[PDB]
Paper text:
Over two thousand unique human miRNA sequences have been reported and more than half of all protein-coding human genes are predicted to contain a conserved miRNA recognition site. miRNAs function as guides for Argonaute proteins, which use the sequence information encoded in each miRNA to identify complementary sties in mRNAs targeted for repression. Argonautes then recruit additional silencing factors that mediate translational repression and degradation of the targeted mRNAs. Careful comparison of miRNA seed-matched sites in the 3′ untranslated regions (UTRs) of human, mouse, rat, dog, and chicken genomes also revealed that an adenosine (A) nucleotide opposite miRNA nucleotide-1 is a conserved feature of many vertebrate miRNA target sites. These t1A nucleotides confer enhanced repression of miRNA targets beyond pairing to the seed region alone. In this study we provide evidence that human Ago2 contains a t1-nucleotide binding pocket that specifically recognizes adenine nucleobases through water-mediated contacts.
We tested the role of water molecules in t1A recognition by designing a mutation in Ago2 that disrupts the water network inside the t1-binding site. Ala-481, which resides in the back of the t1-binding pocket and is within van der Waals contact distance of water B, was mutated to threonine. Our rational was that the A481T mutation would alter the hydrogen-bonding landscape of the t1-binding pocket and thereby perturb placement of the associated water molecules. We first assessed the effects of the A481T mutation on Ago2 by determining the crystal structure of the mutant protein bound to a short target RNA bearing a t1A nucleotide. The overall structure of A481T Ago2 is nearly identical to the wild type protein, and the structure of the t1-binding pocket is almost completely unaffected by the A481T mutation. The Thr-481 side chain is in the same orientation as that of Ala-481, with the Cγ methyl pointed towards the protein interior and the Oγ alcohol extending into the t1-binding site. Although the structure of the A481T Ago2 is nearly identical to wild type, t1A recognition is severely impaired. Only residual electron density was observed for the t1A nucleotide in the target RNA omit map. Importantly, the Oγ hydroxyl of Thr-481 is 4.2 Å from the position of the t1A N6 amine in the wild-type structure, strongly indicating that the mutation affects t1A recognition indirectly. We conclude that binding specificity in the t1-pocket is achieved by Ago2-directed solvent interactions with the t1 adenosine.
Residue numbers in the entry: 22 to 88, 90 to 120, 127 to 269, 276 to 296, 306 to 821, 836 to 859
The structure:
RNA sequence: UUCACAUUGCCCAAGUCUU
RNA sequence: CAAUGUGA
């Protein structure tokens, strides 16, 4: 239950396509490099400060120790191309910097020869410690030149300024990572951008925050309304006077009246520093320890450069950010290439110390474009849809199994002035028309239609409906826009009363269109238990010859900066042989834990419901797990694979179905581009839907592939990466690749191939719904949150999450 | 809250050292 | 899913 399976074979399906990847081939020398442990007292220092210490320590002790150019990981690991005068002997060094003790112990040799063998068929697995060393080599210089953020590097772009307002601006940067592959070692490079605080005087920072055209408007002290807004923006930020300080608070009193025991601030700077403040009417920054009385005037302070903006951007700052960084696929391709030529890695003195060479051109890789499956619809017509470039339509087609809607109601929470009875009548006309074409006929008018206001009217209205109207199938809820009513409608519908609801924005009622209404019917039919369509049965892979269940799993974590909100784990399982219908389980779990804690219980529920639905027991389980990074593969696989087994074992026997465990990663830094201009699709110029890459850039020994299953509308498509961590079923590359691709076509909310398999997509929708059930509510704590996300008995077997 | 795609927010990573 | 864009 541990080591992943090797690649069984290579795919042969689909026509070939010429691609370029943002991977850059690396030539590594076959020489031993020397690894040294370090220790710096004190070691509470920031990572950047540790690099400084070693920086000077290396030059201060050039003679008799560092005669050459070593690299340092910022904590405790130092690498040299040639050995030092050491042995395993410690060396206590005393270093000085505008008071540190640095100890240096040898630890081991790192053979780059053993890496060539691992990348070959010679060695079974890739030595992590070797990949780690190469990474520190490539990161040494940029970790000091630029501002490190994750695996990326950022800097103020020379000659340009991308202001966001509020004292913030866009910095451009790039991601950098070292990866083994079937071919060589690869440097993965991709461009990015993020928000940074402008390194400007605090005075200018105030003006942008408070929206002043200039200071001196006015020369009166700030209103508490202004002083609070400004305090919220600058608190926690670092400022400089030679001397750096983090702002912990903004004083209430102006510098002229704000005092401290040794006297007003404006007077202290008059006497001690001989400075007369130009704006004494303004408050002071309290800096350092919150429990001391260190106050700086705004005039003598700058925001120190290189501080990323962690807080959420405003709506306008966001809009600005999007415009500044949006790029078609070809444009992004050129931005990466331009960056790399300018990057000039090969002139890096440290890269060259270790004799590493980096190719300045994108690796060429051959992909295949898989054929889409045929989609089977219903009605008498029984039409077959044929996806083209990842898209099809429902025109002249009807659901495989459409629901007849006899009893339904409308509840309009939009103001009657805004959303008229006429609007509602007209909306009902068009929806019924579209529902007829669509195969899910709404046979009559709503049995109930009443205006209402506020979250309070929801539950009493829904209780009345459930009691009054027998066989009620659906409540359509009209909402004015963004409102807390939505979360309430879903609380009551999903968890309290177990009633199907379909919300619609007022603006989409006032002005409808055939495409919107059609998409709206896709959701409604599913919610009411229908089947929109199915994969052409005879076109499916062999796996469907025996009972199989398809599982999707995801964990969604709280936003950045949050500290106490729970993580939400969601698992969904197919309930028919199509596969189309899914049931869902959801749990709250520990803050920022990726491992699905209660998975065994969740899978047991799904297996039971599968048997109740199909009267089969799955002979195979295909589990698609979203969002686990490589550094978590072993941990996650260990717990979750055994959890699936546990579920089976506890159910019966000797019930041991084959498990295929697949990790899906949509958010990585691999990008694929069309080599030939006439292969690019649409305005965004992306690779076509179905493009598959299982060679060259993929893993040297293990079973992984990229599949870009969707049409790229805008920007640069993210090709989803799939990694097989376990496979009892012994899939070939072809079967697995085709299976995954076909499951991307079974997503009920649209007639498009989506970017990840339906089961994994549904798991996201389930987690996000739970998050809505928990709005403003996030042992005794756990049970409260657990109950909030527990859906009504009548909702359990439904696709309420659609 | 019609829907997908795209940027960010999510595990790993990153970050968290006299007035 | 939220903010912001591109689209159907
Ligand atoms: Mg996740
Ligand atoms: Mg960590
Ligand atoms: Mg959106």
């Amino acid at each position: 239950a541990f080591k992943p399976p090797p690649r069984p074979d290579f795919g042969t399906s689909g026509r070939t396509i010429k691609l370029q990847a943002n991977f850059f081939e690396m030539d590594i020398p076959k020489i031993d490099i020397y690894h040294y442990e370090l220790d710096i007292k004190p070691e509470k220092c920031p990572r950047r400060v540790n690099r400084e210490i070693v920086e000077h320590m290396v030059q201060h002790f050039k003679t008799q120790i560092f005669g050459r150019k070593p690299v340092f990981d910022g904590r405790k690991n130092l690498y040299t191309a040639m050995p030092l005068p050491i042995g395993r002997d410690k060396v206590e060094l005393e270093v000085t910097l505008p008071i540190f003790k640095v100890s240096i112990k040898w630890v081991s040799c790192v053979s780059l020869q053993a890496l060539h063998d691992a990348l070959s068929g010679r060695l079974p697995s890739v030595p992590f410690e070797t990949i780690q060393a190469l990474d520190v080599v490539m990161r040494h210089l940029p970790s000091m030149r630029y501002t490190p953020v994750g695996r990326s590097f950022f800097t103020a772009s020379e000659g340009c300024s991308n202001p966001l307002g509020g004292g913030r601006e866009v910095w451009f940067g790039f991601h950098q990572s070292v990866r083994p592959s079937l071919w060589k070692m690869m440097l993965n490079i991709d461009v990015s951008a993020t928000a940074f605080y402008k390194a400007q005087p605090v005075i200018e920072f105030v003006c942008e925050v408070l929206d002043f055209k200039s200071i001196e408007e006015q020369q009166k002290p700030l209103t508490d309304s202004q002083r609070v807004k400004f305090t919220k923006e600058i608190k926690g930020l670092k400022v400089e006077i030679k001397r750096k300080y983090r702002v912990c608070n903004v004083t209430r009193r102006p510098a002229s009246h704000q005092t401290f025991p040794l006297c007003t601030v404006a007077q202290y700077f008059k006497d001690r520093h001989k400075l007369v403040l130009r704006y004494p009417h303004l408050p002071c920054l309290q800096v350092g320890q919150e429990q001391k009385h260190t106050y700086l005037p705004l005039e003598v302070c700058n925001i120190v450069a290189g501080q990323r903006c962690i807080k959420k951007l405003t709506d306008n700052q966001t809009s600005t950010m999007i415009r500044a960084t949006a790029r078609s696929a070809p444009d992004r391709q050129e931005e990466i290439s331009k960056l790399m030529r300018s990057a000039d890695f090969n002139t890096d003195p440290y890269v060259r110390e270790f004799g590493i060479m980096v190719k300045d051109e994108m690796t060429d890789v051959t992909g295949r474009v898989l054929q889409p499956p045929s989609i089977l619809y219903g009605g008498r017509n029984k039409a077959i849809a044929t996806p083209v470039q990842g898209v099809w339509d429902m025109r002249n087609k009807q659901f495989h199994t459409g629901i007849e809607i006899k009893v339904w109601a409308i509840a309009c929470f939009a103001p009657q002035r805004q959303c008229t009875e006429v609007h509602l009548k007209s909306f009902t006309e068009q929806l019924r028309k579209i529902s007829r074409d669509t195969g899910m006929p709404i046979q009559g008018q709503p049995c109930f239609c009443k205006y209402a206001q506020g979250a309070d009217s929801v539950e009493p209205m829904f209780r009345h409906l459930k009691n009054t109207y027998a066989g009620l199938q659906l409540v359509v809820v009209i909402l004015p826009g963004k409102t807390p009513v939505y979360a309430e409608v879903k609380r009551v519908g999903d968890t309290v009363l177990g009633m199907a609801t379909q919300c619609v924005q007022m603006k989409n009622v006032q002005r409808t269109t055939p495409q919107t209404l059609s998409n709206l019917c896709l959701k409604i039919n599913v919610k009411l238990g229908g089947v929109n369509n199915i994969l052409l049965p005879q076109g499916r892979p062999p796996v469907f010859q025996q009972p199989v269940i398809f599982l999707g799993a995801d964990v969604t974590h709280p936003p950045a900066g949050d500290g106490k909100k729970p993580s939400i784990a969601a698992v969904v399982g197919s309930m028919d042989a199509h596969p189309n219908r899914y049931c869902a389980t959801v749990r709250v779990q520990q803050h920022r834990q990726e491992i699905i804690q209660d998975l065994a219980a969740m899978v047991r529920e799904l297996l039971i419901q599968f048997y109740k639905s199909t009267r089969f027991k799955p002979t195979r389980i295909i589990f698609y797990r979203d969002g686990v990074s490589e550094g978590q593969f072993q941990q996650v696989l260990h717990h979750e694979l055994l959890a699936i087994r546990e579920a089976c074992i506890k159910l019966e026997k000797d019930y041991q179905p084959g498990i295929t465990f697949i990790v899906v990663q949509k958010r990585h830094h691999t990008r694929l581009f069309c080599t030939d201009k006439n292969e690019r699709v649409g305005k965004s110029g992306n690779i076509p839907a179905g493009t598959t890459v299982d060679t060259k850039i993929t893993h040297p020994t293990e079973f992984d592939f990229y599949l870009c299953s969707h049409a790229g509308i805008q920007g640069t498509s993210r090709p989803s990466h799939y990694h097989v961590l376990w496979d009892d079923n012994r899939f070939s590359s072809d079967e697995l690749q085709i299976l995954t691709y076909q499951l991307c076509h079974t997503y009920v909310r649209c007639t498009r191939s989506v970017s990840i398999p339906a089961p994994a997509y549904y798991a996201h929708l389930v987690a996000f719904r739970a998050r809505y059930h928990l709005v403003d509510k996030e042992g005794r704590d756990h049970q409260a949150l657990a109950k909030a996300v527990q859906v009504h008995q009548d909702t359990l077997r439904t696709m309420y999450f659609a």
